[PDB]
């Protein structure tokens with residue numbers, strides 16, 4: 001909904017400019033142009049709001065990658081699909097991406113937010129483990145290969161968001177080829 | 187013989203900068219965690235900006251030394267990469283605290299002119315090698331800062347993951363991470 005979305009957008013801008021601990025529900029109500037009582041109809045408190053935001057973002061990233069996932073294709077294509085859908089999600093949901101990326105291990109996260117994230121991670125662990133066994137990927141610990149793919153992307157999104165680097169189809173194409181070469185057997 | 191309390195002060199400051207943020211941390215807080223008097227910290231450093239600049243400068247110069255020592259100038263970019271990567275991993279492995287801090291605050295507002303000149307002289311050295319590699323058609327035609335990120339960010343996170351005990355260090359782990367990073371930046 002446009003109400004839910006403006007509450008989350010207004011909450012993200014305040015969490016970034018005034019910190020999560022410093023932000024309150026009335027501040028989000030003022031920036032979203034709604035009543036504090038209407039926010040309390042959707043969310044019991046700020047911790048419920050930030051867990052609805054985190055969870056929805058994770059399931060949107062999970063939907064984006066899992067939608068049209070090329071199950072019958074090779075490792076190369078499954079990687080290409082995952083990488084581009086991951087980059088496209090980050091690119092279009094930078095605040096949510098930068099916010100979700102910055103709070104995966106936060107103290108305010110609830111059991112469902114953690115189960116959503118672990119179920120998402122585990123999906124790629126199993127593909128990576130299958131790739132290692134077939135001799136298709138480097139025999140590195142699966143968590144080391146996720147780090148190799150994810151950390152450069154995560155930082156490049158941050159650097160693009162500051163305007164230090166600029167997005168282009170050519171840049172993602174170069175970054176995707178680089179990440180595939182980093183994890184495959186040569 | 188008068189022992190240098192700077193190591194204990196830097197360790198105490200980083201634990202507070204990590205748990206309470208650099209802006210939230212003060213000199214009395216560092217004095218309490220270091221188990222020293224506030225006045226003894228002010229003997230070494232005029233303020234928190236001086237302390238943090240000393241910490242930054244010292245770490246960057248110890249990392250610079252670790253890579254520039256026995257640097258294989260007459261070797262190919264493959265060997266120069268291998269040398270750089272291993273010396274970088276060895277420095278990070280043995281100086282876990284300071285390495286993470288320093289390379290995450292290399293564009294911070296609190297860095298003085300000398301800290302910035304130390305860092306710019308260090309990074310520019312690798313920018314030149316990367317630019318030569320791109321021109322020769324050996325490295326990927328990516329912005330040089332994107333190739334530094336590709337090499338550095340996975341390493342930085344693997345050090346953090348090893349530091350939690352989730353992953354364990356081994357000579358074969360670094361050998362494989364080094365081959366992976368070279369394959370990430372070269373034209374195959």
Ligand SMILES: [Cl-]
Nearest residue numbers: 203207208209
């Ligand atoms: Cl900080």
